[PDB]
């Protein structure tokens, strides 16, 4: 019931007590671990509101004070007559910071308390949504010196007046299925891209076409918008030693801004809540570029390095993978766009774990996601046992809007 | 209850029904996943169901479920248990058991080979010398001059827990570790503690970087005894690189035969506390973990110095760069010397095929993603993208405590 985690590289041992405050369910049982699966009323709202407000007032060292009790009554009265309630700005901000603090799949959490929260609960239309998004993109981009931010649209009511950003990220490249059979651009966005065309997007049909925004306010049908291009910072990808690298014609965007998740604070559901940080280099260089089902560039790159691709055992895939990731990091650095390499980010996360163990009694973390997708065992997180559990406030996955929205 | 697993690269969905036959616990609860935690004398009472289950399984595999021969063997095991408090496995059952423990080993990427396993029955063994002789034969048979063959040697089962056979070594062949007064380590830091015990038991340590450890063998609950494996039976491979002529001057070698000797084999409720088994290496075991772990040989710094990488900023990926060249060297060396080895691309591709076959023919393949995904280049191997279900089937290989922690010394 009190639990220990061991780092097998350093013998450091931490005791987890935070997991007992755990709430939601994991997918695992005592018979079966589901650790590697990607996706495993008024009467209901009040405990959830209480639980959240209890932790809020404890964090500002005002637990069981008049001001605590008063808020608890006030929120109860609001639920009884309105069926929902509204968060104070202070609670909104605390909730968002903590949803990030609790994201067990996020390696970047050492940063959790430096989060700029933009309160868009007064938003009513898609145009409004678009204005809030550009301002987010611009604020967060900051001419390359990226700053974490989240923009929070109004909460769910009856589930028929939902706010949603249909894109999976604010900024992503298009994907087109071709007559030849293969895919041009980003195969991960093929279906979303079709929807844009269907809604009227004039697609350029290139390899790196920044997608338009598809925004849904108050459960209305969604509308298309083009982010001003002067707002979309991109990095052409070159290599510090290989002059020929430029001719592969690779670029990526500087701002990763996940836009399809649901933020749950104190039982309330914010279905549109795009947030952004900055990239760890492997996200682009390993995953986006080398996933077989993404840009899948290993074959082309290895060809240019004149490696022996006859047998898997020459580790040609591995050699190329390294240089691709050297080139991503080098390019971002040379253009002064914030980026972090996987050594430095995992090292920071180990320091963060220690801090959370020491100040909070633990830190939920999903080893499967924390360990980078290259050079795993040479990063310290590989050797670190982690306990995964589900704390609230949280970010959660939610069904894609098109499978659900009624036109 | 059917369970689905998806490969996010191919969109192949599989359906697990096998997990329904699982008994043992995971360490996970509905509230906590312990999927990354490394380590999460029986009664007559508890033993017959365990026997029955196993024999029900054995007899189904041979298409003789419910046969007279099946019933008679149940009644015979039943009687033997009441009369003697334990029972003996027939040869066939032991072979089937050992193969299934491998088949059930959720952390093993090499399981496509599970049906080709040479089983050496060492249940007639009574002394440490007897153990040494069995072990020597296992090593020579498995090595087979570089054309490695899987094998396991099975020493007598636990009786009252006071008469255990144990191999105190963690692998049959492994290099000494030596902690120096100045705090550095010579040789493999992973074996310092076992090395000290050896020294204390009377081993004369050569005190070099790659000294093959002596075998430390416990028979019948007696104190263990030391034995040098004949060096002519220890196949080793000097490590060189196909293009970097300086690589050899690092002085690295490794042994060809990986043979885990510290695990416990459970079959039909019976506990075989000494059951060394061997396969062959996947390249990364040596070139990533054994050479490049900070708590192992830790050669990344020295290799990157010789390649002249930018070592001032971690974002040069100097570590990743050296890591690949080291692994190229390991594979090159083994292949050039004709010692079986498998790269992590080919081994993981094989596992995916095995796993798919196992779903079609068995209703599942329990698998531990944390261990199956290789320690370098994870996502460019198909297993990274494969959803897995981990659960515990018997027969099985279990962890057991280190014997120097439990052993009652006789003197
Ligand atoms: C500041 C720098 C940040 C870094 C370096 C970082 C890093 C990462 C990485 C590498 C992942 C795995 C994502 C993937 O492989 O697709 C991840 C996931 C995640 N991050 Fe962070 N992140 C940062 C900021 C943030 C912020 C500001 C938030 C929320 C306010 C956040 C919340 C999350 C969540 C919820 C996930 C899991 C999302 C999913 O399941 O796809 N991150 N992060
Ligand atoms: C034939 C070639 C084989 C290959 C390439 C192979 C590969 C591997 C690898 C890479 C691991 C993880 C090892 C580590 O990281 O320390 C492993 C674990 C394991 N293997 Fe296999 N293996 C093979 C044969 C066998 C055999 C013959 C057995 C038993 C009959 C076996 C049983 C196991 C078990 C029980 C584990 C988990 C051990 C632990 O938790 O420390 N393997 N295998
Ligand atoms: C099947 C497996 O869970 C899946 O591939 C996961 C593994 N780890 C991951 N880790 C990160 N950071 N991102 C991912 O998309 C994934 N995919
Ligand atoms: C903490 C973590 O579980 C531990 O480092 C594991 C991770 N994955 C592993 N995978 C393999 N194959 N072998 C190992 O020793 C480990 N170590
Ligand atoms: C906004 S999410 C965390 C913030 C910054 C980040 N680095 N992670 C985003 C996931 C991006 C995805 N892996 C990609 O490679 O585009
Ligand atoms: C005998 S166990 C499986 C058979 C062979 C194997 N490949 N795995 C053994 C573990 C070896 C360990 N990783 C090492 O680096 O020595
Ligand atoms: Zn689990």
From Swiss-Prot, chain A:
Main location, first listed in the record: membrane
Subcellular location, record wording: Cell membrane, Sarcolemma; Cell projection, Dendritic spine
Posttranslational mods: Ubiquitinated; mediated by STUB1/CHIP in the presence of Hsp70 and Hsp40 (in vitro).
BP terms from Gene Ontology: arginine catabolic process; behavioral response to cocaine; calcium ion transport; cellular response to epinephrine stimulus; cellular response to growth factor stimulus; cellular response to mechanical stimulus; establishment of localization in cell; establishment of protein localization
Entry's Gene Ontology molecular function annotations: ATPase binding; cadmium ion binding; calcium-dependent protein binding; calmodulin binding; enzyme binding; flavin adenine dinucleotide binding; FMN binding; heme binding
Tissue-specificity statement: Isoform N-NOS-1 is expressed in brain and colorectum. Found in the Auerbach's plexus of the enteric nervous system. Isoform PNNOS is expressed in the penis, urethra, prostate, and skeletal muscle, and coexists with the cerebellar nnos in the pelvic plexus, bladder and liver, and is detectable in the cerebellum.
Annotated positions binding (6R)-L-erythro-5,6,7,8-tetrahydrobiopterin: 36, 368-369, 382
Presence of the UniProt keyword Ubl conjugation in the record: yes
GO CC annotations on file: azurophil granule; calyx of Held; caveola; cell periphery; cytoplasm; cytoskeleton; cytosol; dendrite
Domain remark text: The PDZ domain participates in protein-protein interaction, and is responsible for targeting nNos to synaptic membranes. Mediates interaction with VAC14.
Function: Produces nitric oxide (NO) which is a messenger molecule with diverse functions throughout the body. In the brain and peripheral nervous system, NO displays many properties of a neurotransmitter. Inhibitory transmitter for non-adrenergic and non-cholinergic nerves in the colorectum. Probably has nitrosylase activity and mediates cysteine S-nitrosylation of cytoplasmic target proteins such SRR. Inhibitory transmitter for non-adrenergic and non-cholinergic nerves in the colorectum.
Protein family (similarity comment): Belongs to the NOS family.
Assembly notes: Homodimer. Interacts with DLG4 (via N-terminal tandem pair of PDZ domains); the interaction possibly being prevented by the association between NOS1 and CAPON. Forms a ternary complex with CAPON and RASD1. Forms a ternary complex with CAPON and SYN1. Interacts with ZDHHC23. Interacts with NOSIP; which may impair its synaptic location. Interacts with HTR4. Interacts with SLC6A4. Interacts with VAC14.
Protein name, UniProt field: Nitric oxide synthase 1
The organism of origin for this protein: Rattus norvegicus (Rat)
Gene name in the database record: Nos1
Span covered, complete protein: 299 to 716 of 1429
